[PDB]
Amino acid sequence: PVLTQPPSVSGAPGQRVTISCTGSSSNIGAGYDVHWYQQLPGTAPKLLIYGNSNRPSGVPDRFSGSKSGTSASLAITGLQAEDEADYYCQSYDSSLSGFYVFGTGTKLTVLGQPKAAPSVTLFPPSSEELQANKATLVCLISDFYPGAVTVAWKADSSPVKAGVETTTPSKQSNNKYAASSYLSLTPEQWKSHRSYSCQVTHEGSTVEKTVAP
Amino acid sequence: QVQIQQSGAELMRPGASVKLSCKATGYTFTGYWIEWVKQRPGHGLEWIGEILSGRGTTNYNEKFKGKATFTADTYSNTAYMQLSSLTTGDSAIYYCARGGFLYGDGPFDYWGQGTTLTVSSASTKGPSVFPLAPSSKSTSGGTAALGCLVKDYFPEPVTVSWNSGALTSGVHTFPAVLQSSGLYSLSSVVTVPSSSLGTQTYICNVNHKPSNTKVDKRVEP
Amino acid sequence: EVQLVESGGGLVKPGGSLRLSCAASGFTFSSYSMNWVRQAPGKGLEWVSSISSSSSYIYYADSVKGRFTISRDNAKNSLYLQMNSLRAEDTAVYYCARLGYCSGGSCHFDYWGQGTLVTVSSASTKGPSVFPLAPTAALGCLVKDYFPEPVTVSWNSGALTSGVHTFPAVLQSSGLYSLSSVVTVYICNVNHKPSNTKVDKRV
Amino acid sequence: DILLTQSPAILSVSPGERVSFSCRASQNIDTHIHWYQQRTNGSPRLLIKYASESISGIPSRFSGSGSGTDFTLTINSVESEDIADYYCQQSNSWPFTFGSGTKLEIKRTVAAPSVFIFPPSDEQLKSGTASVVCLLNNFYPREAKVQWKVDNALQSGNSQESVTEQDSKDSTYSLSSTLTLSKADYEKHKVYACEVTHQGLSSPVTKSFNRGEC
């Protein structure tokens, strides 16, 4: 069990964003305190908020925290480029044998660029790969910002949960982001369907590309 | 706010058993160790053991295993301690205190008010008050000394006032002692001007609520 | 200042053992409870184990309860984590985290070490299998099932550089890497030096 | 078990003094020592945790410092509300143990006890037991010896003593020794004297009375 956190949260420099954190009746709902940790790329999690709302020495007053019910929230005002990091909420859970419970995490993006929808380029299994009795679908996802996506594969109209592995978003040279997803299929399963589709999700919109035998 | 309220005083007979309670409010019950400490009158503190609030695991002192039994109810946020086969030696004040969260290695953070347990075979009895008359030779400092001897009463306590509360200055009511017979005895003395033995009238008002007894005793040369 | 330096991680095979050590300094070590928190690559934080100041109180996560053993030596200012029967899902950066002082309601982790990497993968060195992604259009090459990083790819022997995008690699369940390079407008020059394999594919 | 011995069982302070008492462990204990204060008729109160860390809600004058086997709590400037018992507690190994305690009092000028004697009342005599009460009033320090002599014979195992708490106004103590004899044994003798030796006395003082001779 974890605490639910939004995958991505974005805001322009100087503006204000909030990061939600929800739990259950056995952690935040049970009266346990919530704490927040900030983690920069390549660094360890650093204490940001302790005891629901307090601020360790060194953290600016732009960071504040609140908690109510089974929910907690981290509010950040006057957004700065230095705030770009991963933010984790944390509490204690009395369920199971008792354990510290962490939030899934949130990527905070300070918009120094207009938002960009991802360009999806999908490829089929090569002719040489079916001769090796294999079939791999390549979904290349490039040129999106902020760097956070979600991939789903569709065989005809049904979904595909087996044989899907997706990389994490990677920072391009133009500060946009790139990712890729792979679908390992069998040559018979590649032909037993009418079409295959790769659906990426970026904020609200969804870009989709299809490939067919 | 963190409050730790314990059960009231207990007066038990040897051989019986008593269940002491320790209700803890103002915080999340599950996860904190709850400690139990024994203190005999005029002596120091003595650790009995601990119990985990949520999981009920217990750790007992070698001195108290088989005598103390810890239980806890997560639903009522209450810890209990059962003292079996009661001895007169078990007569003490028993404290419960919130320990460390998850780790009983921490300090005892929030203590209860304590629970006074008295174990004795004696039956409750009202005290006999006898005068401590001022001496015929009372020029010992131009000050005389008088009082009352509150003898043979069980259990504690007695309240002693002088002249229905009108006389408070110079009054010394000594802490009670346990005589060999199992009954408590006490003295309440006061020093008054040696020139006022003939004019003034001195009465000690002795009250012993557990026996529903009240006694006024006049002392005079 | 407070300092925690973890060490003892490395590469191990499914079923092997490691022993982590956390070196503390800058604070009274014996007066704090220590914890281990791990972070799988590109994932979140997971609490692993915790040990009290006197070591008499020890907790584990349910997933490592039967294989892991936490310990500490206050005279050496060191914290230890024994892991046996390591699975693939134990691959993570293992952090040393001090339990800070707080009023009540479960305290926070006030200081963290920089971490020590632990990889449980099996899978020996293996040469990449290259397939052509057939088609301004887009065409590329697929680098399938290799071990380990890095794999470098160029187009037309380093001449064609306008429009080439080499996507970072995925690690599959088999512990084998796979990436793809694409170009928008042909020979791709894949190279894997740990395996001394150089392939050239036409699309 | 681990034994914690607190060296000054009783310590006399004055409002403003810099005071300190000790707590010694039988073995190494690292820093697993907590301190508790207990006023009269009150519960123990957490003062210092882990040898030296302070507790929210405690005045800044309290502070601990020890490590290893020696430990010390210091009150840099004693206030009146600091007059209490002080206990150290170890949390290194089971069972948890406390020190024997250190009691703080108030120092004042030495005062001699006003000694009084009380024969048993005739009413108590008619019941079959005689109680002779020797009273020591408003003295300092608390240390005092009371010897019971019946016809120049020292008595043992038949008297109980009781001491009040230190007076909040003049910082003195009071003592009461009650010699208990049967009515038969009481009438067999004549001279009843209690001997009181105290620091404020150049020599012991005796208070005596002859039975039935008012």
Chain C touched by A15 (CB under 8 Å): no
Do residue D178 and residue B149 have CB atoms under 8 angstroms apart?
yes
Number of domains in chain C: 2
Q: Verify that C83 and C135 share a domain, yes or no.
A: no
Q: What is the CATH number of the domain that holds D80?
A: 2.60.40.10
What is the residue whose two structure tokens read 């103590």? D173
User: Residues 6 or more apart from C4 whose CB is under 8 A from it?
Assistant: C22, C23, C24, C96, C97, C98, C111, C112, C113, C114
Task: Look up residue C122 and give its DSSP letter.
Answer: -
Residues of B in contact with A30 (CB under 8 A): 28, 30
- Domain end, chosen from C93, C120, C147, is at C120
Q: Verify that C80 and C105 share a domain, yes or no.
A: yes
**Neighbour count for residue D26 (Cβ, 10 Å):** 13
All structural domains of chain B, each given as residue ranges with its CATH number in brackets, are: 3-119 (2.60.40.10), 128-219 (2.60.40.10)
Q: Verify that C37 and C69 share a domain, yes or no.
A: yes
CB A171 within 8 A of CB A147: yes
How was this one solved? X-ray
Do residue B27 and residue A92 have CB atoms under 8 angstroms apart?
no
The shortest C-alpha distance from B108 to chain D (Å) reads 7
How is C33-84 classified by DSSP, letter by letter? Answer: EEEEEEE-TTS-EEEEEEE-SSSS-EEE-TTTTTTEEEEEETTTTEEEEEE-
Alpha-carbon gap, residue D20 to D65, rounded angstroms: 11
Residues of C in contact with B2 (CB under 8 A): 104
Q: Verify that C42 and C114 share a domain, yes or no.
A: yes
The shortest C-alpha distance from B104 to chain C (Å) reads 7
Main-chain phi, psi angles of D184, to 5 degrees: -65, -50
Alpha-carbon gap, residue C115 to C4, rounded angstroms: 9
Residues of A in contact with B55 (CB under 8 A): 97-98
All structural domains of chain A, each given as residue ranges with its CATH number in brackets, are: 8-110 (2.60.40.10), 119-211 (2.60.40.10)
The shortest C-alpha distance from C75 to chain A (Å) reads 26
**Neighbour count for residue C6 (Cβ, 10 Å):** 24
Closest to B140 (Cα-Cα) out of B184, B186, B197, B86: B197
> Hey, is B19 helix, strand or coil?
strand
- Domain end, chosen from D106, D129, D163, is at D106
User: Residues 6 or more apart from B204 whose CB is under 8 A from it?
Assistant: B129, B147, B148, B160, B161, B162, B188, B216, B217, B219
- Domain end, chosen from C54, C87, C120, is at C120
How is D69-105 classified by DSSP, letter by letter? Answer: TEEEEEESS--GGG-SEEEEEE-SSSSPEE---EEEE
Q: What is the CATH number of the domain that holds C182?
A: 2.60.40.10
Q: Verify that C106 and C63 share a domain, yes or no.
A: yes
Nearest CA in chain C to B52: C57
Q: Sheet harboring B68-73: ordered strands across?
A: B3-6, B18-25, B78-83, B68-73
Helices (H), A11-51: none
Q: Verify that C92 and C148 share a domain, yes or no.
A: no
What is the residue whose two structure tokens read 């919530």? A34
User: Residues 6 or more apart from A204 whose CB is under 8 A from it?
Assistant: none
CB A50 within 8 A of CB A11: no
CB A82 within 8 A of CB A58: no
Helices (H), chain B: none
- Domain end, chosen from D85, D106, D127, is at D106
Do residue C106 and residue A165 have CB atoms under 8 angstroms apart?
no
Task: Look up residue A64 and give its DSSP letter.
Answer: E
Chain C touched by A54 (CB under 8 Å): no
Angle at C176 between CA C173 and CA C181, to 5 degrees: 115
Alpha-carbon gap, residue C124 to C126, rounded angstroms: 6
Strands of chain D (E only): list them: 4-5, 10-13, 19-25, 33-38, 45-49, 53-54, 62-64, 70-75, 85-90, 97-98, 102-106, 114-118, 129-139, 145-150, 153-154, 159-163, 173-182, 191-197, 205-210
The shortest C-alpha distance from D49 to chain C (Å) reads 9
Q: Each residue of A178-201: b (16+ CB within 10 Å) or e? A: bbbbbbbbebebbeeeeebbbbbb
Q: Verify that D83 and D170 share a domain, yes or no.
A: no
Residues of B in contact with C57 (CB under 8 A): 102-105
Residues of D in contact with C28 (CB under 8 A): 31, 50-52
Alpha-carbon gap, residue A15 to A17, rounded angstroms: 7
Q: Verify that D101 and D125 share a domain, yes or no.
A: no
Number of domains in chain D: 2
Provide the residue range defining the domain that includes C138: 129-202
Quick one: tokens of A149?
């996506």
Quick one: tokens of A163?
């044989």
Alpha-carbon gap, residue A125 to B133, rounded angstroms: 116
Substitution target from A25, A26, A32, A99 for chain B, most B beta carbons within 10 A: A32
- Domain end, chosen from C73, C94, C120, is at C120
CB A112 within 8 A of CB A13: yes
- Domain end, chosen from D60, D80, D106, is at D106
The shortest C-alpha distance from B22 to chain D (Å) reads 14
Does the CA dihedral C160-C163-C169-C170 come out positive or negative?
Answer: negative
> Hey, is A210 helix, strand or coil?
strand
Strands A63-68 and A106-110 turn out to be unpaired
> Hey, is B89 helix, strand or coil?
helix
Identity at A107, one-letter amino acid code? K
Q: Verify that C21 and C85 share a domain, yes or no.
A: yes
Q: Verify that C54 and C141 share a domain, yes or no.
A: no
Alpha-carbon gap, residue D97 to D85, rounded angstroms: 16
Q: Which residues pair with A121 in a beta bridge?
A: A140
Provide the residue range defining the domain that includes D175: 114-210
CB A170 within 8 A of CB A178: yes
Q: Verify that D203 and D133 share a domain, yes or no.
A: yes
Nearest by CB: D31 against C31, C56, C101: C31
User: Would you call B132 exposed, middle or buried from its count of C-beta atoms within 10 A (0-12, 13-18, 19+)?
Assistant: buried
3-state secondary structure B149-190: EEEEEECCCCEEEECCCCECCCEEECCCEECCCCCEEEEEEE
Alpha-carbon gap, residue C83 to C81, rounded angstroms: 6
Report CA-CA distances (Å) from D66 to B199, D48, D73. 62, 11, 8
Strands D62-64 and D70-75 turn out to be antiparallel
Do residue B174 and residue D45 have CB atoms under 8 angstroms apart?
no
Alpha-carbon gap, residue C120 to D207, rounded angstroms: 91
Alpha-carbon gap, residue D34 to D52, rounded angstroms: 9
Q: Verify that C51 and C7 share a domain, yes or no.
A: yes
Does the CA dihedral A157-A161-A162-A165 come out positive or negative?
Answer: positive
Quick one: tokens of B50?
């601990």
Report CA-CA distances (Å) from B33 to B102, C59, D102. 7, 14, 27
